[PDB]
């Protein structure tokens, strides 16, 4: 159940780490290289765990992750949807 | 901080082993196992979460290791089981830090065999 | 990815000499998740590089931090001679994670 997802992904507890651009995420734990204004000690409901695609916010975007990249803050994850 | 890492040679089977680990919060850090055999290599050994919630493992690690943690007593454990020979090795508790998942502070580091 | 390997076994480097260690891992899928350590001769290992170029607390600025795929390498020039040590090189991989082969660094006399 966790490896479907509609819309924006809210519901998505899934595992993938690779975003649209093909970048790898950074650990919902670490500070660096991007200090998470949102990480895993004031939202614990949602499954934040090493570097999955994961949206805690609600985003209109889709499922991001804090994107490895310093360039970027965060970014999508490629996904299709769940039921249809 | 500080972590104490008590331990010793165990040649038949399990061992229970922990290190007393406090001076900093554990409600912030997750914590991060490291073995090292006497060949001079380390195979990083589990590593738990800064709850029980997820705790990692190694692919000859998975079954046989437990790694959990006492946040309100400040102690961190570890207890081993099938210790085969090749298993012998001066283990070390660190604490996460650094972000990225790195190994901010070993502790003092406990010398384990097995040999009968 | 998943695995790693290192490169080479033993170094036996001088005083004050440019010094490397590779570390070959398949493709570097993230070139900020390695990291690198020491093991001074009866001791606790000690970080020292984290995330590739930055060092963690209380590093000798000598340090350094490549990895811009397949290949991560150490530039320590340094002319203390403390830095004798095991070091190890650590890609943060998860479940699959792997350390190094250890790159001890003896001494010339």
């Known amino acids: 159940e966790g490896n479907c997802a509609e819309g924006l992904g809210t519901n998505y507890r899934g595992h993938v780490n690779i975003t649209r651009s093909g970048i790898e995420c950074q650990l919902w734990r670490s500070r660096y290289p991007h200090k998470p204004e949102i990480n895993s000690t004031t939202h614990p409901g949602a499954d934040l765990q090493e570097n999955f695609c994961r949206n805690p916010d609600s985003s209109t975007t889709g499922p991001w992750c804090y994107t490895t990249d310093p360039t970027v803050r965060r970014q999508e994850c490629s996904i299709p949807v769940c039921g249809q | 901080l500080v972590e104490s890492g008590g331990g010793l040679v165990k040649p038949g089977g399990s061992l229970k082993l922990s290190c007393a680990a406090s001076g900093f919060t554990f409600s912030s850090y997750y914590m991060y196992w490291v073995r090292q055999t006497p060949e001079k290599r380390l195979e990083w050994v589990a590593t738990?979460?800064?709850?029980?919630?997820?705790?990692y493992y190694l692919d000859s690690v998975r079954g046989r290791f437990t790694i959990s943690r006492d946040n309100a007593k400040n102690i961190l454990y570890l207890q081993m089981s099938g210790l085969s020979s090749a298993d012998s090795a001066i283990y070390y508790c660190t604490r996460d830090g650094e972000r990225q998942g790195a190994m901010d502070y070993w502790g003092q580091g406990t010398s384990v065999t097995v040999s009968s | 990815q998943i695995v790693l390997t290192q490169s080479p076994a033993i170094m036996s480097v001088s005083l004050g000499e440019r010094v490397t260690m590779t570390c070959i891992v398949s493709?570097?899928?993230?070139?900020?998740?390695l990291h690198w350590y020491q093991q001074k001769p009866g001791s606790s290992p000690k970080l020292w590089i984290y995330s590739s170029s930055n060092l963690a607390s209380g590093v000798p600025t000598r340090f350094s931090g490549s990895g811009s795929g397949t290949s991560h390498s150490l530039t320590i020039s340094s002319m203390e001679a403390e830095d004798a040590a095991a070091y190890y090189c650590?890609?943060?991989?998860?479940?699959?994670?792997?350390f190094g082969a250890g790159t001890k660094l003896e001494l010339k006399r």
């Open positions: 738990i979460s800064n709850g029980g919630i997820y705790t």
């Open positions: 493709s570097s899928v993230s070139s900020t998740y």
């Open positions: 650590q890609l943060y991989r998860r479940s699959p994670l792997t």
